[PDB]
Amino acid sequence: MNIFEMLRIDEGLRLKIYKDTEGYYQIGIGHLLTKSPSLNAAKSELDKAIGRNTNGVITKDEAEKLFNQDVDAAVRGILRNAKLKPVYDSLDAVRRAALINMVFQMGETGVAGFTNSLRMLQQKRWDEAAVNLAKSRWYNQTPNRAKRVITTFRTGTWDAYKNL
């Protein structure tokens, strides 16, 4: 199991534009297009992303290219983030994947706001950060996903993803 397999599971794969769980426009493997209400604005963003006239549709190959670019950017955002970096540097390989996952989903900014859980993660207080993480809008809006990530942080293994 790896970050790619992990997020593919959590985000799914869709070849047509679609609304995410907050009503935003996305496509591919969790690729956010626009926080705006226009399907047109989204088709515009999409073509610019793809570099061609899509018409709201991309190939698997295309979706995977956005995917690679997005995982890369998440990793680099964490590395450049003064609040995230040290957390990330203190964790083991599985747990780093769980941090990239949250970052991919909600942006560096959003994650950097989990100040208290970040502190516990840094201190290796597993079970307490797990409880802290659960007390969030994030866990309330997408609980199943939140639970897989959170278990990952708790146990340091891929258990929550095996089967899926």
Which residues of this chain interact with Cl ion, rule CB under 5 A? 49, 142, 144-145
Nearest distance, CB of residue 122 and Cl ion, angstroms? 26
Nearest distance, CB of residue 140 and Cl ion, angstroms? 10
Query: Annotated binding residue at 136?
Result: no
DSSP 18: E
∠ at Cα 31 (11, 71), nearest 5°?
A: 80
Sheet holding 14-19, edge to edge: 14-19, 25-28, 31-34
Does 11 qualify as catalytic in the annotation? Answer: yes
- Report the Cα–Cα distance between both ends of the chain, in Å, rounded: 11
Write the single-letter amino acid at 105.
Q
Nearest distance, CB of residue 95 and Cl ion, angstroms? 20
Angle between helices 3-11 and 143-155 (to 10 degrees): 160
Q: 10, 11, 45, 108: which is the annotated catalytic residue?
A: 11
Q: Tell me whether residue 6 or residue 87 sits nearer to Cl ion (CB atom).
A: 6
Query: Annotated binding residue at 36?
Result: no
Does 20 qualify as catalytic in the annotation? Answer: yes
Query: Annotated binding residue at 4?
Result: no
Structure tokens at 116: 């208290």
Which residues are known binding-site members for substrate? Answer: 32, 104, 117, 132
Which residues have a catalytic role annotated? Answer: 11, 20
